[PDB]
């Protein structure tokens, strides 16, 4: 019961991309259960940015997955403790972006502390160019390891009619004694995230949902 | 018009794994239209294999795919001219598994010739230990590159409660003419590839489901 329809939500995320520094915040609101959230991120320092904030937004929220069939829920049961998660998303034409996040919970409101380290995107690419359109739908495989939740992503960056595909390495890992926490089984968590609205390379918002499931087809 | 709801599969695949040379013949059938299919497969030479079948069973068939929404169908359109695909799968304990398949039609019989080479299993890993347990279903990702279908999927093999991830990189090309075909958008394709049946790392039974969809998540 530590978690109420509406959450509010609170960022802080520090980083270098390609050399160059930024620091942004974030507030937000969602509703954890039904797995849908906003936030709005202000660029304090380093604006405008001079990439693409596209590979940035999915370091900016697990807490808000609606979870189906009866899928033990990691991240709520991590509460009160919280929770952390790593994660190295690496593009098919180079760049390499990794991020470490903390998540605790004071009150109605949900703290993320992020660490962005990106490295190597071709000078010439739509991410330094800053001419891409946001993500695509996509597909998390979950599964556990010793306790720890491991996730493996394909994601796809709209540039034009063109895509280019990254794959993200996650592991998230519970502030919560092992033993009072049951680990969910191998399954799948469908992502939105978009991005609607977006100013001057400073302002952003973001818009997600999540839902934890197994897969459609039957097993014969 | 050219398929039938009932379609026969021969299948030959020449490989050499680990420096483990093999020949296979397989025998299948299934519904295109459902997406729905089965196969018998006999290994001719190299038997007993001394590594896990399953790394071999993504490489025995995407003219069986139930296409939902309207997402137009690369590969039933590629007939009679056919298709072929080639593939990349690597796994994260660093085994790699190249391979390249032809499908043509003839009559009601669908005609596969399966080429791989496969290199650096690591000698204590599960696969060539014979140690797995099949794979846990999977979903793809789809999408159009000048007329090429492109694909990027992440597998599981199952190796008691633990996963073995592997990254499959395909690419689909058809033997139609670029102007004559219809080329899908971005979408994503459900697999649950199964193994019901097997005997003496020689004789394999594999059934096969697979749906193209768009996400279920609804677009805010």
Known sequence: ??????????????????????????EGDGNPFTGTQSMRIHVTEGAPLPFAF???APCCSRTFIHHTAGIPD????????????????????????????????????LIYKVKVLGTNFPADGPVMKNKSEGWEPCTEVVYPDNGVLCGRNVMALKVGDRRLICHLYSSYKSKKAIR????P????????LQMPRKKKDEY???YEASVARYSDLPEK
Chains 1, 2 share one sequence.
Not at 4 to 26: A, L, P, Q, W
Request: hydrophobic letters at 35%; a negative charge; one cysteine or more.
């Open 1 to 26: 019961g530590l978690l109420k329809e509406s959450m509010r939500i609170k960022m802080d995320m520090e980083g270098t991309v390609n050399g160059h520094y930024f620091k942004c915040e974030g």
């Open 180 to 183: 009072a926490l049951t680990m």
């Open 185 to 192: 089984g191998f399954h799948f968590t469908d992502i939105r």
């Open 74 to 109: 990691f991240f709520k049961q991590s509460f009160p403790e919280g929770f952390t998660w790593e994660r190295t998303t690496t593009y098919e034409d180079g760049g390499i972006l990794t991020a470490h996040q903390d998540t605790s919970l004071e009150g109605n409101c």
């Open 54 to 56: 596209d590979i940035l």
């Open 204 to 206: 952003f918002e973001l």
